[PDB]
Design an enzyme around this catalytic site. Structure first.
Site, PDB file in Angstrom:
ATOM      1  CG  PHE A 209      -2.104   0.955   1.097  1.00 53.92           C
ATOM      2  CD1 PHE A 209      -3.181   0.676   0.270  1.00 53.92           C
ATOM      3  CD2 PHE A 209      -2.131   2.123   1.835  1.00 53.92           C
ATOM      4  CE1 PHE A 209      -4.265   1.568   0.176  1.00 53.92           C
ATOM      5  CE2 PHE A 209      -3.204   3.007   1.749  1.00 53.92           C
ATOM      6  CZ  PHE A 209      -4.264   2.729   0.926  1.00 53.92           C
ATOM      7  CG  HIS A 212      -1.884   6.297   3.243  1.00 52.00           C
ATOM      8  ND1 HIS A 212      -0.995   5.244   3.248  1.00 52.00           N
ATOM      9  CD2 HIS A 212      -2.580   6.210   4.408  1.00 52.00           C
ATOM     10  CE1 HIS A 212      -1.166   4.534   4.352  1.00 52.00           C
ATOM     11  NE2 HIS A 212      -2.121   5.098   5.074  1.00 52.00           N
ATOM     12  CG  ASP A 214      -3.993   7.028   8.640  1.00 47.34           C
ATOM     13  OD1 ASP A 214      -3.497   6.588   7.583  1.00 47.34           O
ATOM     14  OD2 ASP A 214      -3.846   6.483   9.747  1.00 47.34           O
ATOM     15  CG  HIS A 268       1.466   5.939   7.437  1.00 42.42           C
ATOM     16  ND1 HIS A 268       0.765   7.107   7.616  1.00 42.42           N
ATOM     17  CD2 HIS A 268       0.547   4.944   7.438  1.00 42.42           C
ATOM     18  CE1 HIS A 268      -0.523   6.827   7.750  1.00 42.42           C
ATOM     19  NE2 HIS A 268      -0.680   5.519   7.649  1.00 42.42           N
TER      20      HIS A 268
HETATM   21  C1  LIG Z   1      -1.911   1.087   7.207  1.00 44.75           C
HETATM   22  C2  LIG Z   1      -3.190   0.323   7.654  1.00 44.75           C
HETATM   23  C3  LIG Z   1      -3.933  -0.462   6.518  1.00 44.75           C
HETATM   24  N1  LIG Z   1      -4.429   0.455   5.488  1.00 44.75           N
HETATM   25  C4  LIG Z   1      -5.618   1.052   5.571  1.00 44.75           C
HETATM   26  O1  LIG Z   1      -6.451   0.658   6.364  1.00 44.75           O
HETATM   27  C5  LIG Z   1      -5.802   2.233   4.623  1.00 44.75           C
HETATM   28  C6  LIG Z   1      -4.745   3.345   4.852  1.00 44.75           C
HETATM   29  S1  LIG Z   1      -4.836   3.927   6.567  1.00 44.75           S
HETATM   30  N2  LIG Z   1      -7.103   2.844   4.897  1.00 44.75           N
HETATM   31  C7  LIG Z   1      -8.169   2.812   4.119  1.00 44.75           C
HETATM   32  O2  LIG Z   1      -8.113   2.210   3.021  1.00 44.75           O
HETATM   33  C8  LIG Z   1      -9.427   3.501   4.542  1.00 44.75           C
HETATM   34  C9  LIG Z   1     -10.474   2.409   4.912  1.00 44.75           C
HETATM   35  C10 LIG Z   1     -11.719   3.167   5.468  1.00 44.75           C
HETATM   36  C11 LIG Z   1     -12.847   2.179   5.751  1.00 44.75           C
HETATM   37  N3  LIG Z   1     -13.244   1.362   4.524  1.00 44.75           N
HETATM   38  C12 LIG Z   1     -14.060   2.987   6.218  1.00 44.75           C
HETATM   39  O3  LIG Z   1     -15.099   2.985   5.489  1.00 44.75           O
HETATM   40  O4  LIG Z   1     -13.933   3.624   7.302  1.00 44.75           O
HETATM   41  C13 LIG Z   1      -3.051  -1.536   5.899  1.00 44.75           C
HETATM   42  O5  LIG Z   1      -2.888  -1.624   4.677  1.00 44.75           O
HETATM   43  O6  LIG Z   1      -2.535  -2.321   6.760  1.00 44.75           O
HETATM   44  C14 LIG Z   1      -3.312  -0.177   9.071  1.00 44.75           C
HETATM   45  C15 LIG Z   1      -4.024   0.968   8.668  1.00 44.75           C
HETATM   46 FE   LIG Z   2      -2.670   4.693   7.147  1.00 45.48          FE
END
Ligand SMILES: CC1([C@@H](NC(=O)[C@H](CS)NC(=O)CCC[C@H](N)C(=O)O)C(=O)O)CC1
Ligand SMILES: [Fe+2]
EC number: 1.21.3.1
Length: 329
Positions: A209, A212, A214, A268
């Site tokens: 990923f 980005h 958050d 990150h």
């Molecule tokens: C970096 C980390 C995770 N990525 C993520 O969760 C990524 C970037 S923070 N975040 C998202 O896509 C947003 C999801 C929002 C969720 N569907 C909602 O409707 O509220 C990963 O890939 O592990 C742990 C948070």
């Molecule tokens: Fe994140």
């Protein structure tokens, strides 16, 4: 090699109590971390994370392709037009490794006024069959409330850190209307691991990923003990060490907005690792109509040249933008 990021471990237990001086000393630690790399581990948080991990594993490893279609968000299943946020996010073998299950406030029931009004970002959760996943819904809903409680305590720390009264953020973070979400993300071990599911950063680092900020006020994260996260600092991307006993905490861009970037939303990214692991974020979102007047703790009069932004506007726009930037997860 890549340098290790400074990610202090902060005992957040005083934030649950009534020792105001002790809470200020925690707030100072939060302030320091927020002004440095933007990450810290909350320890002595009181949540049974081993049981979270076990229950989540049982779910991820037993759910079937049939159930995933039946729970799928609209990005994967056109029949489910109401499921933008809540539901199953399918893998695509050969192309996309990650899969996940997202749920929202358990109080978003069919009779909830925001559900009745069909307000954007509010949805009624979908759940697998109880007989196929005994105890799962009940566990997951209780987890929501456990991590909500931790997050409320953390928000008291952030408020104090910024020179405010401890309810400054928490008064907008309410069980009846929070837009907070839990995501239960499975990152699989795959042999062979498809190259199409591996992204490559400009610096050559293999990623799952991309970079980005958050979409959250703060993010409250449990992950397995497999190192994967990197944070951009003035010294470049640095590795955030794993700690499967703590919660990794950082600010999202709503906090950066409110504080005029005094507490930045750290940039990150997630390294590609060929390991079966879990990433279980709780995104601390306020209510749809929550508005906090932006301020600036580096300015004598506290004033900011930013305009107030409602949390609902922020969230709807941010989640779309993140999908456009880094892809549908
Ligand atoms: C970096 C980390 C995770 N990525 C993520 O969760 C990524 C970037 S923070 N975040 C998202 O896509 C947003 C999801 C929002 C969720 N569907 C909602 O409707 O509220 C990963 O890939 O592990 C742990 C948070
Ligand atoms: Fe994140």
């Amino acid at each position: 090699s890549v340098s290790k990021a400074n990610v202090p471990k902060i005992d957040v237990s005083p934030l649950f109590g009534d020792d105001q001086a002790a809470k200020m000393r925690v707030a100072q630690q939060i302030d320091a971390a927020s002004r440095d790399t933007g990450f810290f581990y909350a320890v002595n948080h009181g949540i049974n994370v081993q049981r979270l991990s076990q229950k989540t594993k049982e779910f991820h490893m037993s759910i079937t392709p049939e159930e995933k279609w039946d729970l799928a968000i609209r990005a994967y299943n056109k029949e489910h037009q109401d499921q933008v946020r809540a539901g199953y996010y399918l893998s695509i073998p050969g192309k996309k490794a990650v899969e996940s299950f997202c749920y929202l406030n358990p109080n978003f029931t069919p009779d909830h006024p925001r559900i009745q009004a069909k307000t954007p970002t509010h949805e009624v959760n979908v759940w697998p069959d109880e007989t196929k996943h005994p105890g799962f819904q009940d566990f997951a809903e209780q987890y929501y409330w456990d991590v909500f409680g931790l997050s409320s305590a953390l928000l008291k720390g952030y408020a104090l850190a910024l020179g405010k009264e401890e309810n400054f953020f928490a008064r907008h973070f309410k069980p009846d209307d929070t837009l907070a979400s839990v995501v239960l993300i499975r990152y699989p071990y795959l042999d062979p691991y498809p190259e199409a599911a591996i992204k490559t950063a400009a610096d050559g680092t293999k990623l799952s990923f991309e970079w980005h900020e958050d979409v959250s006020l703060i993010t409250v994260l449990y992950q397995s003990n497999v190192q994967n996260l990197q944070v951009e600092t003035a010294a470049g991307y640095q590795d955030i060490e794993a700690d499967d006993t703590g919660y990794l905490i950082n600010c999202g861009s709503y906090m950066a907005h409110l504080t005029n970037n005094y507490y930045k939303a750290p940039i990150h990214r997630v390294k590609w690792v060929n390991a079966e692991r879990q990433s279980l974020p709780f995104f601390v979102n306020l209510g749809y109509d929550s508005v906090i007047d932006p301020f600036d703790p580096r300015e004598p009069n506290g004033k900011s040249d930013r305009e107030p932004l409602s949390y609902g506007d922020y969230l709807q726009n941010g989640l779309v933008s993140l999908i456009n930037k880094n892809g549908q997860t």
